[PDB]
Design an enzyme around this catalytic site. Structure first.
Site, PDB file in Angstrom:
ATOM      1  N   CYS A  96      12.799 -21.501  -9.367  1.00  0.00           N
ATOM      2  CA  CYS A  96      12.955 -22.950  -9.436  1.00  0.00           C
ATOM      3  C   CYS A  96      13.295 -23.457  -8.041  1.00  0.00           C
ATOM      4  CB  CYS A  96      14.041 -23.339 -10.436  1.00  0.00           C
ATOM      5  SG  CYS A  96      14.512 -25.084 -10.349  1.00  0.00           S
ATOM      6  N   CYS A  99      16.010 -26.293  -8.182  1.00  0.00           N
ATOM      7  CA  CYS A  99      17.384 -25.886  -8.454  1.00  0.00           C
ATOM      8  C   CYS A  99      18.089 -25.410  -7.189  1.00  0.00           C
ATOM      9  CB  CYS A  99      17.407 -24.786  -9.517  1.00  0.00           C
ATOM     10  SG  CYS A  99      16.433 -25.127 -11.004  1.00  0.00           S
ATOM     11  N   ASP A 100      17.364 -24.722  -6.303  1.00  0.00           N
ATOM     12  CA  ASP A 100      17.963 -24.067  -5.145  1.00  0.00           C
ATOM     13  C   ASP A 100      17.465 -24.617  -3.815  1.00  0.00           C
ATOM     14  OD1 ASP A 100      19.650 -22.050  -6.468  1.00  0.00           O
ATOM     15  OD2 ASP A 100      17.745 -21.198  -7.150  1.00  0.00           O
TER      16      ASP A 100
END
Lengths: 277, 303
Positions: A96, A99-100
Site C-alpha cells: 500500500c 499507507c506508507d
C-alpha cells in the site's frame, strides 16, 4: 456446530456493509473476519462444503453452519516469495503506497510491477518521494494509454526512473530497514544495485477464493456472479451463496463499489431466506 | 452553446458520486441538478439511509470545483455527436454523458403525508424499516411493490398493517402465497376498501393513520409508529424515450462483469442510480454505480 441463518465471510467495505443491512433486516448476521446485532468472530476458515444444504464452513476455532452465505473475502496483494522480501516486510517492504508513502518524503523508493496498478503507485509516490524507480520484467507496461503518457512525461520531465527487463533479486538492508535492492537483468543475468529507502511490490491482486475452488463457478480466480438488471445480482452458481466486493469485481475495485455490492448481497440473501417457506 | 467533456444529469447520490470521481480524474465535470434554485442532524451513523451520503458527495464535489448548474432539461439529441441537451435556461453539449435522473417514488399527495416525509413517512422499507423493530407499521399500496414491502417489514415489525384502496392485491404468484400465509398465520393485517385520509403524529414522528372507507365514507384510526407509501416509482426518463433502449421507463445498461457496465445503447452515454435500478434503490448502490459510470466515462473519453 454454530448455526446461523446468515454467514458473512470478509471484513472489507463489502462485508461490513452487508452486515449492517443484514442486521437491519433482522437476520442476526454472523461475520467471520481474518452498532447493530452483529456477531463479529475472529477466525480463519480452511474447508467449506457447499454440496449440503446447511453450508458447513470449517475454521480453526470452530465449525459454522448457515442457510445463506455471503462471500466478501477481498483480494490480497501478490508477492514474489523472496526470503529478503519476506524478511523486510513492514520494515521497508509494503504493498500500500498510500499507507506508507509519507514516510519517504524527499527520499528514494522503488516500485515493482508492470500492470496498470503498479504505475498508479509510481505516479502517486512521484509527487511524494525524491525519485521513484519502476521495476518491471518486460520492456512494455501493460497499462492504459493515458497511464503510459502520464508515465512517459513523468519519466522524461519528472523524477520517475525506468528499469525495464529487471527482476528484483534481493532486498538489502540492516537491522533498521531497507537500504537498497538488487536488480537482475533478465537478459544477461547480471546484477545492478539501487540505493533506496523503501520498496513497494505492486505486481497484481489475487482473489481469496482458493477455498471454494471446485464448488463455485469461477473465472481466473474471481467468483462468477449472476449480475444483471433483474435483481439477485450477487448470486453465485450455488443457490443461497452470494459474492460481493473484490472477489467478484476485477474492473472497478473501489471501496464505494464494494460497499454497493455488499448491500446487494444482503438484500439478495434476505430475499432468499424469506423464500424458504 | 455551453460545452463540456463530461455532463452529469442528476442531483442524487449517483450523480454527485460520479462528479466526485470525475473531478478526481481531472475530467472537470459539469452537473445539471434537474431543478432551478430548516435542517437535520446528526443523521444515520452508518450513512446508509437519509440524505447523509448525498450531502457528503455534494460537498466533496464542490470542494473539487465541480460546476453545478441549476436547470431542467427540455429535450435531448443523441443522434449527432457531441450530444445536445436542450435545457430550460440554456442548452448544453458534451462528449460523454452520465444519466442519473433517478426514479422518484410515487406519493399519495396528502398534506400530512408531505409533512411527515423523513419523520415517519417513508417510501423505502429497506431504507427505514429498521427503525421499527417489534413495533406497528402501516404499508399503503395494493400492487407488487406494497406486497414486497409488507413481506420485508414482516420480519422486522411486530405488526404490518397493509392498506389497499380496493379488495384485492395484484402481485407475483409466490409473493401472494407468502402474504396469504403471513395474513392467516403471521403478523400482517389487511385493511381493504380503505383510503389514507391523514397521517397523524407529533414533532417526533408518526403515531397513527386515519383511514376512510371507500364504500361508506366513515373513518377509523390505526396506531402505527411509521407509514410506508409503496405505490410504485416513476423513472425520470421521459426526455430520452425514443432515443435510448428502455424497459418500463428504466435505462437499459450493459451490466455484466467485464467492465463498462453502465454503458447505455448510445456510446458515450452512461446511466447510474435508480434510473437503471428497480431492485435495490439504496443510496450506497446508487453511489456505487455512480462511481462505475464516472470510470466508464473516463476510459471512454481516453479513446
Amino acid at each position: 456446530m454454530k448455526h446461523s441463518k446468515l454467514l458473512i465471510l470478509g471484513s472489507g467495505p463489502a462485508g461490513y456493509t452487508a452486515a449492517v443491512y443484514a442486521a437491519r433486516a433482522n437476520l442476526n448476521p454472523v461475520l467471520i473476519t481474518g452498532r447493530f446485532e452483529t456477531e463479529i468472530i475472529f477466525d480463519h476458515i480452511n474447508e467449506v462444503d457447499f454440496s449440503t444444504r446447511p453450508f458447513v464452513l470449517k475454521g480453526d476455532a470452530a465449525s459454522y453452519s448457515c442457510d445463506a452465505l455471503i462471500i466478501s473475502t477481498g483480494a490480497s496483494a501478490k508477492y514474489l516469495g523472496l526470503e529478503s522480501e519476506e524478511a523486510f516486510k513492514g520494515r521497508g517492504v509494503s504493498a500500500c503506497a498510500t499507507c506508507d508513502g509519507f514516510f519517504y518524503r524527499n527520499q528514494k523508493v522503488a516500485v515493482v510491477g508492470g500492470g496498470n496498478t503498479a504505475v498508479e503507485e509510481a505516479l502517486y509516490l512521484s509527487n511524494i518521494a525524491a525519485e521513484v524507480h519502476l521495476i518491471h520484467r518486460r520492456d512494455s507496461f501493460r497499462a492504459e494509454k493515458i497511464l503510459i503518457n502520464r508515465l512517459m512525461d513523468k519519466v522524461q520531465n519528472g523524477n520517475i526512473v525506468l528499469h525495464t527487463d529487471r527482476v528484483l533479486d534481493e532486498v538489502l538492508g540492516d537491522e533498521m530497514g531497507v537500504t537498497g535492492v538488487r536488480l537482475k537483468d533478465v537478459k544477461t543475468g547480471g546484477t545492478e544495485e539501487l540505493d533506496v529507502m523503501g520498496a513497494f511490490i505492486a505486481i497484481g491482486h489475487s482473489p481469496n477464493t482458493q477455498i471454494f475452488q471446485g464448488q463455485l463457478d469461477m473465472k481466473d480466480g474471481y467468483i462468477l456472479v449472476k449480475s444483471g438488471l433483474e435483481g439477485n445480482a450477487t448470486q453465485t452458481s450455488v443457490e443461497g451463496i452470494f459474492a460481493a466486493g473484490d472477489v467478484m469485481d476485477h474492473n472497478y475495485r473501489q471501496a464505494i463499489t464494494s460497499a454497493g455490492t455488499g448491500c446487494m448481497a444482503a438484500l439478495d440473501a434476505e430475499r432468499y431466506l424469506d423464500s424458504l417457506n
